[PDB]
Curated annotation (Swiss-Prot), chains A, B:
Location(s) in or outside the cell: Virion
Annotated function: Assembles with the minor capsid protein to form an icosahedral capsid with a T=7 symmetry, about 60 nm in diameter, and consisting of 415 capsid proteins. The major and minor capsid proteins are incorporated into the capsid in about a 90/10 ratio respectively. Once the capsid is formed, encapsidates one single copy of the viral genome.
Organism, scientific name: Escherichia phage T7 (Bacteriophage T7)
Family (UniProt): Belongs to the T7virus major capsid protein family.
Subunit record text: Homohexamer. Interacts with the connector protein and the minor capsid protein. Interacts with the capsid assembly scaffolding protein; capsid proteins and scaffolding proteins form building blocks that assemble to form the procapsid, each hexamer of the major capsid protein interacting with 2 scaffolding proteins.
Lineage summary: Viruses, Duplodnaviria, Heunggongvirae, Uroviricota, Caudoviricetes
Superkingdom of the source species: Viruses
Protein name: Major capsid protein
Region described as Intercapsomeric interactions: spans on this chain: 4-8
Length: 50, 50
């Protein structure tokens, strides 16, 4: 849902976009895991910051 | 600050610039992590002297 966030907390919710691009371009079945690890770090950070 | 580092002696404060291009250009987890490590060691060095 667009343009809205509950209250004006400085809250973000936020969704982390994947490093590089194209699922089908990744399909190594390895490094995809590296992307998920990286993403888990970053999501841990985003979630922590709020 | 411009001048105005009290007394004089062996004292100015160091802002450790980060190598590689500007922040928007490096865009990585591993790269940024590496840079923060190297910068941390450099920082330890700069604080150890004086």
């Amino acid at each position: 849902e667009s343009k809205y966030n509950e209250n004006i907390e400085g809250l973000g919710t936020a969704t982390v976009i994947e490093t590089t691009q194209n699922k089908a371009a990744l399909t190594d079945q390895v490094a995809l895991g590296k992307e998920i690890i990286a993403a888990l770090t970053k999501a841990r950070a985003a979630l922590t910051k709020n």
